[PDB]
């Protein structure tokens, strides 16, 4: 209910109109998605390679709902592991 | 014999088997506890990303 | 037209102190973000459809250190005023500017506020609290709150006035090298912390792999009447060289594991956790399973 | 309790403030040096409360919650252990380390469980706040955020009253009644659940060119003469030299 | 036909008998035919073509024993495509085998015989110093499973690839593997020379100093009836840093360790390397080393 | 006597298996860690062989046969050291290191000439195999190969039974007749002779580019809390990092 | 003429005595003329030019004693060429001397006084803890070998170099050698700073903490008698993890070492770096550090 | 007395050699690890001199003169401390670090002022050499260089020879009169003063590219089983690998 719809969104995005700067990121995401790889790593790579392309001005309007879905509640990090190292790391 | 229960910044909590009560033994001084907290926190921040891998 | 004057920004800083409180395991620190933005959002455009779109816009995921969120709120105010009156910034630059400096700022704020300033202030407060003096809680409160309020105001104002001078820097380079160095250091100290902070000692009372018996002259023999000086000297020398205790030599599983390589059990448990996570298994299930496994291993006396 | 019902309401107020600052985490009303001292101000002996706060502060270092990983909740420890002091009219500074501090740590773990439960609870309130946000009501969002804050404050306020009405020895009997097997198993399982966090941060960072650094760090750790700072210095130096060589090539 | 996967597994299992018929005119020739028997029998049993195929596999077959799965795979693929498809004569397979046996042997030798075998034997026989019971079973698990990991996966890779990449071998990947194996082997060999080359120079003689420790510099043991605060003080000084009886005897080995641990082992290794560079046989060097050890013990130096 | 009546019978079988392996040199049964342990498991004290196997393996390093040479052939040495250990009930771990492991070197020396003599016998077997090769019998070469295998393997089975039948006083006095300056001298030599194989392997792989790695390994090794597996991990990661940086 | 090599060997064997006539107004001048005496004796004795040479070679000249061999070589070449060929006036010899009087003294003083001398002395003293005879022997052997090799090779290189290559030095190989030596020196300097800068802060006072232990966390010593299984139990407790007398005195140095060993030494090294950068004579800092140590002992906090 | 009657003339000989070696700094006869060893080996107890020299050299690091800044002149320090050692038989290794090393530092300061006076005295000798240079005599420069040599070298032989005449009671009471606080502080300062030389070296050689190697060496030093030569080998290997990788 997550990977399939993410694939559909990426497929719809990569054909309408895409600039060359994020073409590499989208292609890398698709290549790591069809390959059986960890979803959070794909999400992090897709989200991190778009921050300059988003904040400055551009974030091409075609890939707007894609960034919205990647920055949603489920796809975020919550820093569970880093927190466990930081907080519970020396507890026991 | 003392069984380990939990570890804090200054000292650890044990259970005494000769008696039947949990006993806290303090091992770190205020300077030592503070320094250990600084080092542990910075190394736990370094263990994961410093924010660049979240 | 609105300029977001000093008094409303001061109220925003004061109300940013409630950033936590609507703490969620679904969207962390959303209610506090919206609550702190409430004054400026009401000033710019209240009681409209755009007000609802703005409330849904600011009630999204936000996970940062609360102290370093005054730069975020200031840059957000600077972007929002010029979005309402000036430019046509869509609902993609605000979220992007939030996410871009939500992560690194949290990762730099956690070790400096929770693990650098708070330990120092607390240790100083506790060092002079050994006499029951009232000055210790007063010192802690005053120092901590002065530093925190000064930070929350200075950085808020700096983030507001600059606005674009940090967005341009975030849009540039020099971040790839920092990220790669952070990854390298992360793996190095990650392996170190896996070896050091994880202890799965398998001694137990039972679960012994070798209980061979020793022989006369192969261990330290003890008297029963008088340990004396000379035979005490011989016993101490025997213990010093390598000689073992009572003849029944006991070797545990942890002994063999440590002769293979120290910290191997932690590494294997970590690798199994990586495999399970890659196999789409929620970490809460693994946490509960590890807890019950530890309980059983303590009851089974293998640990 | 030296004074009348005034101290009864003052301890409840102090507990409520500690419960609020447990999540606010700014004014540090949940820190033992503040909470214990405030509870000692309002009920007679201030010096005993300040001594308890100073002793518990060293334990409370490193009790900071980071990134959806809750800490052992020094608020409940500082409130409840100090109240146990108040009920048991002895402050010899040996009774502290004998009974109050271990009780403080156990109640800290209990408060960690309780605050995790209330953090799960607050999600429904925030969902209702978002539902009201669509209606365009700023007041609804503000009031639901305040309700969540109030619930978290009551999470510590209610145990204060319950522990005030409960006999002093019952708490110690209940604390010592749990089998040592359960506590030891919990400790040894907690010493392994952190591997889950290690695994997730590895999976969120792993790359084929940086695994060698992971294994070099793993194999260079058993040296005991290397402190944590020395090993971090090694990691930073390795990163800098590797990046220098990568750039120069 | 088509070399069903169960037949591939049988060939993999029986390929472990590649050696055994070691010769001088045709070294290690019987085992290759033995491992090729199943495919030859399946494709054409009891025929003159089977006889000429046996004759075409009887020539020089001298490769490293462990790296033979790619050879078997390429041979099987060639036979499969020639017995039903093309008409490759018994000249191309001989050429490719001769061309890719030399370099393949020369990469297999320094990554298997002298890179992983000595280090695996060393880790098996180092923890075995204290009479460890696990070491034999550990060696069984770590070495015999290495063939299941390598000789099968490489066999499948070579069978899938056919003869497409056999000509491209040595195009840059084999040199990298050689360099990495050499680096790892040099590192571990230096470690082994430091650790497991015992030139302990303690001896009854060969004492460089015999200074007597004075009062307070050694543990003072009372005249019997050791009791409270006495045993306490003695354990305190013993644990802190203090030494036993006031004679301080240090040997040449102590000074050598203070310069560099395992210095004499490194010197001996360098000397025997120089001697072996002069085409001096290993056995006479072994005998000379035993003799020098004998006379060192006779001199009460070693 | 020992653990069981069948222990002696199984000792002969395990000795025959060890002898077959010692010339096969594939299953490593002939190595001390395996040869001692297998017989000790059945011959009473199971852990006695493991201690002896571990103590003898560290000396039996680099005892290979290279280029038509005769190795000390630990197949006989380990078996003789273990059987003498079980016959004489003394496991002080100083007896093993003083009169058993040093005696294993002399037993390996004897096994060298023993296996040379049994090796010279196989010449006639291979000669008659060549003679029967042209007879057209495929099974002939197989049966004569197995006959040579059995003849070469019985050279370990026979002395095992001889030591089992011989009286303990005879072997005890033979062991006591060994001068101990000789025993300690070739014990030192056996500790030494690893350098020959080390020099061989170093000579095979040595470049002006990889010598620094050798010296770094030599310098980093005195850290006692680094087991050899940790050292192997060190070498692998160093090599990977170096190759990654060079190929850039 | 032609400066036969035995003359150069004698020149170095007397340049061993470069100092001895040390002065303040005219530093290190007599030794230089004495070292160059044989060359002038061979070239032009007993003349007006001879006394003019003695007078122009007895002027101010200050450099590190070991890094002066290139100066000897270039001066020898210049004087012999001027006596045989060209008519170089008394302006290029002094010019070539002064041109590298500064940089050579600045590069050879910390390299030879505070880089190799401390490491050699530290090794020799570390292997002299037991009174071993080989410590002064090792020190003398290694120091003399390094000094003689450096001096001879540098003077030979300077003479072969002349006045041209001695100025065009620094092409390709010299930069790589400099960078590698700098890397090695920084590593060894870090090791030295951590190891042999002792700021032990134990003190009778400055006891940061004196927290008490509790029953079951320290070894209990029977005051009456310890004979029997009591000694074995005490030894087991001591060997497992248990501690001595129930008072844990935590000194400041203990917490500093908990942070990192040799931290105060690193801080003092940085402070001395800053002081030296502020143009302060080293002897002033030495006296100040002695006074600081005296004051630290006065407070009993050392 | 001591080892022999010739021990006295060997004391004066080694003191003269230390005097010549003090400013020349070629053979390091003036160094404590050489001076103390030579002066103790001749004066009876051989290992005591080596122990004292090894203890004193570790605080005598960074004691070299740089550009008219006269060094603490370990030449007199080592001779005086060791001769005081052999005068009063106390080699407890607590006397060594309690009442000898600070006395060595005080005698080092005394030697510094003495060598400053002799250094100023040599100016007139060098002026006489310049006056004799115009006479055309090549031997005049040699003679007025050797005269300065022997005049400066006598500054160690004279006090060492005079000390053997002074009765031990006077030197003993003078040593006892020094407060222990001063001695302990001098020892601490001596352990401190090597940071000056280390800082000078770091200041000469420092770059944004080589600091990480300094920090790596600093953080790998607490490993006590890595000797100084091992760390030097590690540094050489790291430098070589860095250069090979950068040049690629
Ligand atoms: O770092 C992220 C941030 O998120 C959590 O919710 C808070 O408890 C903070 O303490 C933490 O620092
Ligand atoms: O590679 C050549 C090959 O020759 C023979 O078959 C055997 O000695 C093998 O061990 C070796 O690998
Ligand atoms: O470099 C300056 C130089 O000045 C003088 O010649 C002597 O003190 C030398 O030891 C010193 O090195």
Can you walk me through this structure?
The complex is a heterooctamer, with 1 copy of chain A (about 90 residues), 1 copy of chain B (about 55 residues), 3 copies of chain C and 3 copies of chain D. With about 90 residues, chain A is mostly helical. Chain A is built from 6 helices and no strands. The radius of gyration of chain A is 15 Å and the shape is globular. Chain B has about 55 residues and is α+β, with helices and mostly antiparallel strands. Chain B has one domain. Chain B contains 1 helix and 3 strands; from the N terminus they run E-E-E-H. The longest helix of chain B is centred in the C-terminal third of the chain and has 18 residues, at about 30-45. In chain B, about 75% of the residues are buried. Chain C has 2 domains: about 5-170, no CATH class; about 250-300, no CATH class. Chain C has helices at about 5-15, 30-45, 50-60, 70-85, 95-125, 135-160, 165-170, 175-195, 230-240, 255-260, 265-280, 285-300; strands at about 210, 250. A two-stranded antiparallel ribbon of chain C has the order 1-2. Chain D is an all-alpha fold. Chain D has 2 domains: about 5-165, no CATH class; about 205-250. Helices cover about 80% and strands about 0% of the residues of chain D. Chain D has helices at about 5-25, 30-40, 45-60, 75-85, 95-135, 140-165, 170-175, 180-205, 210-220, 230-249. In chain D, helix 1 crosses helix 6 (about 140-165), helix 2 (about 30-40) runs antiparallel to helix 3 (about 45-60) and helix 4 (about 75-85) crosses helix 5 (about 95-135). The termini of chain D are far apart. Chains G and H meet through helix 2, helix 3, helix 6, helix 7 and helix 8 of G and helix 1, helix 2, helix 3, helix 5 and helix 6 of H. The structure holds alpha-D-mannopyranose (MAN) (3 copies). One alpha-D-mannopyranose (MAN) sits at the interface of chains C and D. Chain A: This is Lactococcin-A immunity protein. Chain A: Keywords: Bacteriocin immunity, Plasmid.
């Amino acid at each position: 209910e997550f990977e399939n719809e993410l694939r559909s969104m990426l497929a719809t995005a990569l054909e309408k109109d895409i600039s060359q700067e994020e073409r590499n990121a989208l292609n890398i995401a698709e290549k790591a998605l069809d390959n059986s790889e960890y979803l959070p790593k794909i999400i992090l790579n897709l989200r991190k390679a778009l921050t300059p392309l988003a904040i400055n001005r551009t974030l091409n309007h075609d890939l707007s709902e894609l960034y919205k879905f990647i920055t949603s509640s489920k796809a975020s990090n919550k820093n569970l592991g880093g927190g466990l190292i930081m907080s519970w790391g020396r507890l026991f | 014999k003392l069984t380990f229960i939990q570890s804090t910044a200054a000292g650890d909590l044990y259970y005494n088997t000769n008696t039947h009560k949990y006993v806290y033994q303090q091992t770190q001084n205020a300077f030592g506890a503070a320094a250990n907290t600084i080092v542990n926190g910075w190394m736990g921040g370094a263990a994961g990303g410093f924010g660049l891998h979240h | 037209k609105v300029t977001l004057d000093k008094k409303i920004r001061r109220s925003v800083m004061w109300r940013s102190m409630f950033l936590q409180g609507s703490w969620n395991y679904e969207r962390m620190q959303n209610g506090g973000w919206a609550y702190s933005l409430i004054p400026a959002l009401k000033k710019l455009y209240p009681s409209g459809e755009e007000a609802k779109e703005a409330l849904k816009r600011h009630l999204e995921f936000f996970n940062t250190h609360p102290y370093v969120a005054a730069p975020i709120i200031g840059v957000t105010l600077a972007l929002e005023e010029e979005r309402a009156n000036g430019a046509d910034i869509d609902d993609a630059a605000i979220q992007g500017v939030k996410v871009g400096m939500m992560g690194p700022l949290a990762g730099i704020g956690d070790p400096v506020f929770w693990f650098t300033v708070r330990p120092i202030v607390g240790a100083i407060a506790a060092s002079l609290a050994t006499g029951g003096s009232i000055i210790a809680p007063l010192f802690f409160f005053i120092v901590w709150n002065a530093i925190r309020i000064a930070f929350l105001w200075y950085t808020q104002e700096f983030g507001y006035k600059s606005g674009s001078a940090i967005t341009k820097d975030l849009g540039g380079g020099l971040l790839q090298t920092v990220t790669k160095g952070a990854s390298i250091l992360g793996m190095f100290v990650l392996g170190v912390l896996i070896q050091r902070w994880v202890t799965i000692n398998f001694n137990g009372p039972n679960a012994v792999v070798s209980k061979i018996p020793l022989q006369k002259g192969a261990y330290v023999e003890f008297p029963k009447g008088s340990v004396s000086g000379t035979q005490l000297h011989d016993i101490l020398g025997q213990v010093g060289n390598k000689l073992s205790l009572d003849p029944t030599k006991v070797t545990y599983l942890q002994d063999n594991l440590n002769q293979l390589i120290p910290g191997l059990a932690g590494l294997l448990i970590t690798l199994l956790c990586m495999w399970l996570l890659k196999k789409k298994v929620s970490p809460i299930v693994i946490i509960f399973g590890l807890f019950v496994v530890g309980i059983l291993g303590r009851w089974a006396q293998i640990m | 309790m030296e004074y009348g019902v005034l101290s009864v309401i003052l301890v409840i107020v102090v507990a409520f403030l500690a419960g609020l600052e447990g999540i606010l985490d700014q004014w540090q009303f949940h820190q033992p040096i503040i909470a214990c001292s405030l509870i000692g101000i309002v009920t007679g002996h201030a010096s005993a409360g300040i001594i308890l706060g100073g002793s518990l502060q060293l334990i409370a270092l490193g009790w900071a919650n980071v990134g959806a990983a809750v800490a052992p909740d020094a608020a409940l420890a500082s409130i409840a252990s100090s109240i146990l002091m108040v009920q048991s009219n002895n402050f010899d500074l040996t009774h502290i380390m004998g009974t109050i501090v271990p009780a403080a740590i156990l109640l800290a773990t209990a408060g960690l469980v309780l605050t995790t439960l209330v953090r799960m609870l607050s999600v429904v309130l925030v969902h209702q706040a978002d539902r009201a946000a669509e209606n365009g009501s700023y007041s609804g969002v503000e009031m639901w955020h305040f309700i969540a804050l109030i619930c978290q404050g009551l999470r510590i306020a209610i145990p204060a009253g319950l522990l005030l009405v409960i006999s002093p020895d019952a708490i110690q009997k209940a604390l010592a009644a749990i089998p040592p097997v359960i506590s030891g198993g919990l400790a040894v399982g907690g010493g392994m659940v952190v591997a889950v966090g290690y695994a997730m941060v590895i999976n969120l960072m792993a790359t084929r060119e940086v695994w060698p650094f992971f294994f070099l760090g793993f194999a260079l750790a058993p040296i005991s003469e290397l402190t944590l700072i020395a090993t971090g210095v090694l990691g930073v130096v390795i990163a800098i030299v590797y990046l220098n060589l990568q750039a120069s090539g």
